[PDB]
């Protein structure tokens, strides 16, 4: 529409809107950014390399007083879509990522209300490091965290806030290997820094143990059950060595396979 | 399933007298993260239970 393009040209006019500048008013006031993580898919947990891969939608909300207009002057328009690469953004990234990918994947449009409110819900595929506990494998429970920070602005320039105290599962596809237990979020400060602020989510996930039960535990139990038979085998039959050496070989091979499944950490031994 | 047994079954105490209720489990209920997840609830007649204590060292607001 002619009115819509007039409005979009007016809003993003580089002569009077610089996207490099924080939308700060009242001097030393700070920009408040609301964050909310929605989980769409838990793509995989890789125990060996200790990485979790997720598909998430990262809701980010703030107010930019410079992106305001009067609806009566623009055909009564209440909100418009703007390209997120042409407006100021809080550079909120995943700090504990693996693969060195901090930003979101797509950079969708931002919805902008006439009063300056900005809604931005870009999708992302994230790979995050997490500490894998091997002790109770394959009946283990994992605790993998996702730390979100701004890598441009500190606590004196923006404030990160949680829209909700848990992550959203409204559009979640179940995994089939991992069961979701809890997804709490917390806002952390540093009493000795005063410029540090992050929002962390704890992903508490519980392995469904049937697959590894069937494929590892039962074969292991079956092999172990043979360990006693050597002492009931008569010495005349001439087969004791065959049996005991075969059992030892099978146990060692299973130990090596397990060692190849779990991460090669030394903080604990799987039971 | 873990079994919780509460003693005494009844506790008579006049107003202003300290009360003590003992709660024992079938086995340990400790967790790796360094917390024990035990909780206390009260149910006045005709009303749904209410939360009093969680993570016993803590207290619900």
């Amino acid at each position, epitope marked *: 529409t002619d009115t819509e393009e007039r409005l979009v040209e007016h809003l993003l006019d580089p002569s009077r809107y610089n996207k490099l500048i924080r939308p700060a008013t009242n001097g030393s006031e700070l920009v408040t950014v609301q964050l909310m993580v929605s989980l769409a898919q838990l793509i995989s947990v890789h125990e060996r390399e200790q990485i979790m891969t997720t598909n998430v939608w990262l809701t980010q909300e703030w107010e930019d007083y410079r992106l305001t207009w009067k609806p009566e002057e623009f055909d009564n328009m209440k909100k418009v879509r703007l390209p997120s690469k042409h407006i100021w953004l809080p550079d909120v990234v995943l700090y504990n990522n693996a693969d060195g990918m901090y930003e979101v994947s797509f950079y969708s449009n931002a919805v902008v209300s006439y009063d300056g409110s900005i809604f931005w819900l870009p999708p992302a595929i994230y790979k995050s490091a997490c500490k894998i506990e091997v002790k109770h494998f394959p009946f283990d429970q994992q605790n993998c965290t996702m730390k979100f920070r701004s890598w441009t602005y500190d606590r004196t320039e923006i404030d990160l806030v949680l829209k*909700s*105290e*848990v*992550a*959203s*599962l*409204d559009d*979640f596809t*179940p995994s089939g290997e991992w*069961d*979701i*237990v*809890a*997804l*709490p979020g917390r806002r952390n400060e540093n009493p000795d820094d005063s410029t540090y602020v992050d929002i962390t989510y704890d992903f*508490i996930i519980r392995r469904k143990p049937l697959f590894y039960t069937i494929n590892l535990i039962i074969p292991c139990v079956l092999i172990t059950s043979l360990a006693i038979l050597v002492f009931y085998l008569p010495s005349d039959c001439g087969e004791k060595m065959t049996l005991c050496i075969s059992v030892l070989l099978a146990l060692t091979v299973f130990l090596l396979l397990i060692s190849k499944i779990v991460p090669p950490t030394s903080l604990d031994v799987p039971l | *399933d873990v079994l919780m047994t509460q003693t005494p079954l009844s506790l008579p105490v006049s107003l202003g007298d300290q009360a003590s209720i003992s709660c024992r489990s079938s086995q340990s209920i400790v*967790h790796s*993260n360094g*917390n024990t*997840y035990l*909780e206390w*609830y009260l*149910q006045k007649p005709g009303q*749904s*239970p*209410k*939360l009093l204590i*969680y993570k016993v060292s803590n207290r*619900f607001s």
Partner: nanobody
Amino acid sequence: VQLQQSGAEVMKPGASVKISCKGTGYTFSSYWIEWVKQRPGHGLERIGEILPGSGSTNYNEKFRGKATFTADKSSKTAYMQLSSLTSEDSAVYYCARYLPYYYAMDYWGQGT
């Protein structure tokens, strides 16, 4: 936040009943819903739980097969279906919010 439970139900032995719990004012899909049974004599017995966001459910030993949980994400409601009913099943049933290992079950339904 508020959890709203359906009304009272009177059924014949061997019939089937379905109770509902509707949660509002919070992220309904991200909280487990706990179902509790309280026979008129005494005792709070937990039937099980369901996480609306996924389909995951857990049942106690005594209620396996007896109770089935389901959840509707569109209308923020969770349903418990009870199997063939007996006079032993007459009680008051509660629905409550819960997030394991964190802030825990601080809100309950009025009871059915």
